[PDB]
Design an enzyme around this catalytic site. Structure first.
Site, PDB file in Angstrom:
ATOM      1  CD  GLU C 258      -3.006  -1.446   1.289  1.00  0.00           C
ATOM      2  OE1 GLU C 258      -4.063  -0.324   1.516  1.00  0.00           O
ATOM      3  OE2 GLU C 258      -4.213  -2.349   1.200  1.00  0.00           O
ATOM      4  CB  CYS C 292      -1.929   6.491   2.407  1.00  0.00           C
ATOM      5  SG  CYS C 292      -1.088   5.862   3.711  1.00  0.00           S
TER       6      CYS C 292
END
Lengths: 483, 483, 485, 483
Positions: C258, C292
């Protein structure tokens, strides 16, 4: 008095719209301990009028329960699960008291019963819908699942906790409400689970426990338009009636009914393991479970050895009051249960079978575990459920022949077989016309696997990833959009 | 005569055990063309004794058909699918002839019907079982899915091809055999499908097609122990009786019954798309279907504009014989149906509604598409299905009101609504108590999505990944092994 | 002396968890953990050696057989105990987290409950690892598919979500029957160690979960070169994930990633404008913009541009900045000075190219930075291509749906995207057209445990959470068995 | 001249953007027949600049191909499947000619290759998404699956047809486009599939076949930003490189690599079944498949008797030109391969193995099926794949020792075992660290199950329910709505 850590678990009233009530007319049902005939207490005999009020109260609670998130319903069900676990000993004593089974079994049932609530708390968050590729451009296809609505359960006496949670858990998890009528012989366990339901935060009207005459209550639950789904566990005869009684409003129905379980031991069985399997699937709950081995088919080569080993074990079984240390067989539930085991015995013996051990009355509702040898397909037990602690041992020569006799029944709940051969495991497990098959094991019961019957043993499944859908309706949404 | 490229598709016999047969007593049913009254042909009126023979032939064929691989059953079914597509024109003519709908609709219905066969040929290879984590060490849990067995289908006149393939495709794909009884008014399409079934290499007894008295044949099919599943599409009254008749042997049952479909047009609808969806859902098959819009709810702000726009389109519908170019509305099926439409028109007008266009007999079984404005909830059409080409336009003010009114029926088959608003789309699609919901489209039919109803509209689903399981029994296998 | 006001002091560790023991580095060297709000030293943790890492890997291999041989039910019960313990200790874990990372306590508390939710979820999933039976093309055969744990696995986790990034990897791994070695970020290791204390306490056996602190390069090199490790899972910069995937290649390791995002947040003329402003505030300014999935580029349709900016500007003015333990504080300090430099580079680049800094965007002292807003942002500005990872809302004007779709997708990234419209059809078009693994429609908060989280394109590999998460820690086995009919 | 019914299937050009092209500089690769050494024809050696244009061509086609309905992509793929099946013989002749396998194996492979196209044609319509219960009220959670985009496939020589279809069928079904580079040694079969792909209606740029230098073409495919997924089947060494090459752009990647397949025969196996299983897993394709038995482990009690029975069958193996009636063993593919097979024999015998049969050059690239006894873990064939028609028989004493030895490798592609005991089947099948396990069968290949490896045998799966997801991206949508 019962020696309960929490005496508020033992109830003499019904749970209706979050209050504990008596019958409008004050009439009651006595609950008696099958071990000694002592009266444990009474429960109401509710009228149809009151049942109609419970149904209205269910419909009124449905909106708000269904409108909660899956996560909120799951938190509340998990509290109920935790409460049952923390009060397991008390619940077990109530059950042994009214039903007969020994405390260790009762306790085992409570944990098993609790496991469906845990399992369906987790399922509530996993009610997944679909998207499906559309055959035309400019459309999107969705499938969602929503609760059926107000639901009804009618439950038997042989598993007074677990038959309730197997129905109430998935129903409440799916966002439905439920009204439960427990069997007259064993209502107190249900009431105790209702006390804990309320303590868990299951709101007023979401779960209701009603007691009274089976026929009148059953007829209202199946005729009232508000009830959209019935789940019943009990005899095939009653199941047939209930399905008919649902037909005028096309109600969703789940049924778990009679069986006639064959238990097949082949020459290449692990014979000792087969003996242990027979002991657990035949003698648990004094033979009074829906999945109990009813016919034990043993291959010629191992017949005498199997019979001799089984006798050694049956002879050691301690019969007595379920609260007494070491008792593994309790009394039978009612006198007519005993008459039936006797009739099975007397029929087999009159056709040439040998009662090689036990099968005798011991006084009151107690009956001695027993074994017949030389049992054949023309004997009554070949076609009818004994529902008692009797092992009829049928000889057979060939696999084809045994499969034919195993399937030669209107029923199809549970079957069992023992063999070490890989290939025969495949053939026989597939050829058996049964909803559930134990291979090399007599204990198949859990919450994670779908439980239920084929043929006349019922409709629908309980437990597992497949259980919650019994309480959901599928909706297909076809949406057009501007590209 | 009918101009068939393959006249051997027009049958006068039933398909029983791979042979084409007449009744034993020679009796027959005449099939007439509703457009002109001409007699197309006759079909047998089989006796219950012959039906019993067909049931035994079915059970004879089951073993062999079930033992085939999924792959081989798929090959055969695809062959059938392919033959139907190749003979689509001939089938569509037989259909229009007996049923009345225009050739183009009949042709559309034939492709739709064939698509179930293709779909389920593919699903045959995708009957997936499970492995489930065992709560105890030394055990492994498996679930497999196997054919229910001998099944029966009883099918209506309004889609005389697709209602058959919706049932027979999944049954046969799953490894079941089926006996189909088509409606007396439209049996020839069924028999045509049966001819192509033979050509496809579906073996004797796997599919059988029997014509005759509804009550007597239906009674045998629901009372014979060999038959383990019934699937019925038709009237709710008859569905209630059939469920009750299935109850003594606890048969698996699928029903698709009445609807009272609401079609809701909000102020923020794409008004023009709403009119086209209304025309498509109301006037297709001359309104003769349980998913047809029965109640058209139009929000006050756009009510007048919508009526005007709909009138202009309704007045363009050309009524006539269905084999004739440009015809989009054929004859209604029988005289009693026309009287129902008249009853709904007079009732409504007598209560304040205005018949703004059409709505009058045209000769024979022809009836002119119509629209009522000013329709309200005390009128007969609010609670009864018209099954004809009449658009009743009900005014409403608020979302809440229209939802309450849409849901105020014992039925729950299809519903439709039009809005451009995202939130409203979620609110209304979820609150509508229907098994199927069209959002901004009036055409929702296909083979890939689950079709069926909630409430008294039926049990089970057809098409989709969910359809095959109606013909499968779930088996849980619990295997112990030596670690 | 002095201490954090922990209710349970035993949650604050200065040692690594290696094979069921709490250890220091063989050479005694340490990493200092500093509170970014005031520069105070909270504590140290070890800087472990590659040799100690190799011993942790052997320990993980040794623990695996017994952990995998437990029933799903046992592993679930153990996992649910850990979950219950996290919940019971949430306030102390939150204070540890706020102390080392900077986020306000309410946010820290929120993250701990979010972290915990993965453990609950995967405890439940453990018992739902279903395989298949598949119809055999040939008679006399039976086909089965089972799923078994991949084995020894390694996690490398960032500082921005110091609890959740760990639970999102460890919960599914352990649920599946794997063991896991976790290396958390040097900037925020204490939270991870607190989770380890509660793992032990839950009965997670020696070696099954281990937490090792030390140099990223060296420890990552060992984890990725050692044959015993069969899967890596990493969350952090794209540059590092690129390196790590290359380093797994020699032994073909299973890998989950990720990585970076460049989230577009799109407000159309037919949005509920106040709700979009709220959604912007939460996706831009949570964790001071260091998440993120944080909105990176805020696209607003010309018709509502002015109104949107004015509303956002009023909300941004009310943001209280301070030590994350102070009441009312909703913006903490940034994690380190280089993060500030980047936010400043983004401001200066934008203004140099015509954008206007309408509020904020200044250093406040220490590691504190004032939330701010740019207007007149365009595609040729740096922020159009690079993540700011700071509290800076860049407001891009656009005219049409087609133009904003093309701009949204003009990026190597594809993690999270957001959009506001009340129109049904547009919702379909935009949500399908956006090249992202995750899309929020009419909301700026999409995070939970039940849906699959991850990216397309260069934003990563695999999904976390949901019915799909556990399969990242499982291998599929196809068994074809012949039998005699 | 090859005796082809349709000589347009033999190509000497590459399929690039709907056109057949040569290299811009005219360079070519000769394709020789390993049975005799003749040149069959040439194919281009395309430049990197030409590869870049195919890639742009693929990106341009993506959008239109993705925008099609699944129904439409499925129809195109099913036409492709139909055309392959119609041209099977000729594709088979092309394949035998270029890689050496007999016509019967070649035919088998074409049918197998084709099954993937049929299967994913059907999967295209079953790309299902989800709905998931939202933890928050006012939110709905959806999951959809969309095509990864432009994809690249690099395929080996040992299955020159199926390795392509296994990658292109799911890619195209998903809505992706794909550029395939087939192996230098066997490109003609690819180009034939290419001819039919065009014929099928697969649009220009959707599928493309490029031939040329591996390193150069694969460097471009793995570094070009436009390519979002690579799927490669071939050597582990090259897999390791391709994966590192994907890293700078985080490319999606499927790999099927080296195996070192153990084939285990227990004392309670069906011994002749096990010999037939061994013949088929060791000697198909002259032992040149990925999943071929490389280490044949035989329990001490039945070793000599198994070795005896294996020797009888090997001896009957007709070696020859693949086009020759009765030939079951063709030439090996290249001299390099013989060298290694020879090295395995030399090492084995030098460490004590006996070469009880064959194992020697027959001239050209033909090499005689052999068997070694006394093989042990310290020999070369224990850690390296022979990739030839050599059976090394390792003896073992216990289940535990043989599991340990089976798993003592970096690989984990396929394994096989033969036992009649149920409990042993569970234990060994679960203990073996492999992606695919054959139990009592040497033939495990089909399109419906998932094929792939664990450890260093690869990433991802092909065929089955699980295959299409390798070409899809998951998108989670979280939508807030006004309640």
């Amino acid at each position: 008095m019962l020696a309960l850590k929490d005496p508020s678990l033992l109830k003499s009233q019904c749970l209706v719209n979050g209050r504990w009530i008596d019958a409008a007319d004050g009439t009651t049902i006595k609950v008696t301990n099958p071990a000694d005939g002592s009266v444990i207490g009474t429960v109401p005999s509710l009228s149809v009028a009151t049942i109609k009020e419970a149904i209205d109260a269910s419909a009124k609670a449905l909106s708000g329960w269904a409108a909660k998130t899956a996560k909120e319903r799951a938190g509340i069900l998990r509290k109920w699960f935790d409460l049952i676990i923390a009060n397991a000993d008390d619940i077990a004593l109530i059950m042994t008291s009214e039903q007969g089974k020994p405390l260790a079994e009762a306790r085992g049932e409570v944990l098993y019963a609790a496991s469906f609530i845990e399992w369906f708390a987790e399922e509530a968050k996993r009610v997944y819908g679909d998207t499906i590729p559309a055959p035309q451009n400019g459309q999107r296809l969705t499938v969602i699942r929503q609760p059926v609505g107000v639901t009804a359960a009618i439950t038997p006496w042989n598993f007074p906790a677990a038959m309730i949670t197997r129905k109430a858990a998935p129903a409440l998890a799916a966002g439905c409400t439920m009204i439960v009528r427990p069997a007259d012989l064993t209502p107190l366990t249900a009431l105790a689970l209702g006390v804990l339901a309320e303590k868990a935060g299951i709101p007023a009207g979401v779960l209701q426990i009603v007691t009274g005459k089976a026929r009148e209550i059953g007829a209202e639950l199946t005729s009232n338009d508000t009830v959209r789904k019935l789940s019943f566990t009990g005899s095939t005869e009653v199941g047939r009636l209930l399905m008919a009684q649902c037909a005028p409003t096309i109600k969703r129905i789940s049924l778990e009914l009679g069986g006639n379980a064959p238990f097949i031991v082949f020459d290449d069985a692990d014979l000792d393991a087969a003996v242990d399997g027979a002991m657990v699937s035949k003698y648990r709950n004094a033979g009074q479970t829906c999945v109990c081995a009813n016919r034990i088919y043993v291959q010629r080569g191992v017949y005498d050895k199997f019979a001799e080993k089984l006798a050694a074990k049956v002879k050691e079984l301690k019969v007595g009051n379920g609260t007494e240390p070491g008792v593994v067989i309790g009394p039978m539930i009612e006198e007519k249960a005993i008459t039936k085991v006797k009739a099975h015995i007397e029929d087999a013996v009159s056709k040439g079978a040998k009662l090689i051990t036990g099968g005798k009355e011991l006084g009151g509702l107690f009956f001695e575990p027993g074994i017949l040898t030389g049992v054949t397909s023309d004997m009554l037990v070949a076609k009818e459920e004994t529902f008692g602690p009797l092992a009829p041992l049928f000889a057979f020569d060939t696999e084809e022949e045994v499969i034919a006799q195993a399937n030669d029944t209107i029923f199809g709940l549970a079957a069992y077989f023992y063999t070490e051969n890989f290939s025969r495991a495949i053939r026989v497990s597939e050829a058996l016309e049964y909803g559930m098959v134990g291979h090399n094991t007599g204990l198949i019961s859990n919450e994670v696997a779908p439980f239920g019957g084929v043929k006349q043993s019922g409709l629908g499944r309980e437990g597992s990833k497949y259980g919650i859908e019994e309480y959901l309706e599928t909706k297909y949404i076809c949406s057009a959009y501007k590209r």
